[PDB]
Structure 1
């Protein structure tokens, strides 16, 4: 019954069922709804000391740990989900990628162009949906499918 990658799960704190996508790392209380040759996505990348290139326009030498990058990703996701902050706003200010200057937009792409975990999460998102933390050799991403 569930669309690609989704599974039912049990919430530790409340006991209420929720849904988790192991391809995108998304999670939500609501039952999910539901492939194209191309999708369009934006992202916010947080790099760490084990990133393929630990440098960015924000910081010449990125020194934070993988665990610290994941905490930062978690906090941005919280603020996007509560509406305190827009995704485009946080990507512009804090993404460790040159795509930050374009509010995180990467344009359209097909399968066979992106790093595999990014590509998989991108094509498993529905239009308008956001990923959880997505791990690649560049760092940790939040992905927003826009088309």
Structure 2
């Protein structure tokens, strides 16, 4: 299996699925390094974020658990296609990159927060992460290049 993937069993349905413990991605099909990657993200901050402030909210007060619930809901909408990642990033990301549809540009290893970097470089081109935790908050990461 590709880097960081394991087999798991669905608790509701009993069907086998696959889980990546670096990106927190999960998918039903069996899963299919560069100097740099290009990613977008959607950040949901919380009261324990290193800077609990954003363009959306001068004082961010939501709990870490409430932030995770928001992230999980956004992931549901992106995967069902009801909403686009770029649309939700522009509207709801607590990062200044919201105004760029969440795009962060290209980057190398040794520039970004470690959990963010590890998830970014473990994603395949076009693939989206599950919830990724850093000192800034909780992220959904989309690798675009």
Q: TM-score range, shorter-chain basis?
A: over 0.9
Task: Name segments (4+ residues, structure 1) moved above 4 Å.
Answer: none
In structure 2, stretches of 5+ residues that fail to align are none
Mapped partners of 2:96, 2:107: distance in 1: 17
**Residue 22 of structure 1, CA deviation:** 0.1
**Residue 50 of structure 1, CA deviation:** 0.3
**Residue 89 of structure 1, CA deviation:** 0.1
Mapped partners of 2:84, 2:13: distance in 1: 28
In structure 1, stretches of 5+ residues that fail to align are none
Deviations 1:93-120 (A, max 9, x none): 0000000000000000000000000000
1:73 aligns with 2:71: yes
TM-score normalized with structure 1 length: 0.98
**Residue 31 of structure 1, CA deviation:** 0.6
Provide the residue aligned with 2:18 in structure 1. Answer: 19
TM-score normalized with structure 2 length: 1.00
Length, aligned pairs only: 145
**Residue 7 of structure 1, CA deviation:** 0.3
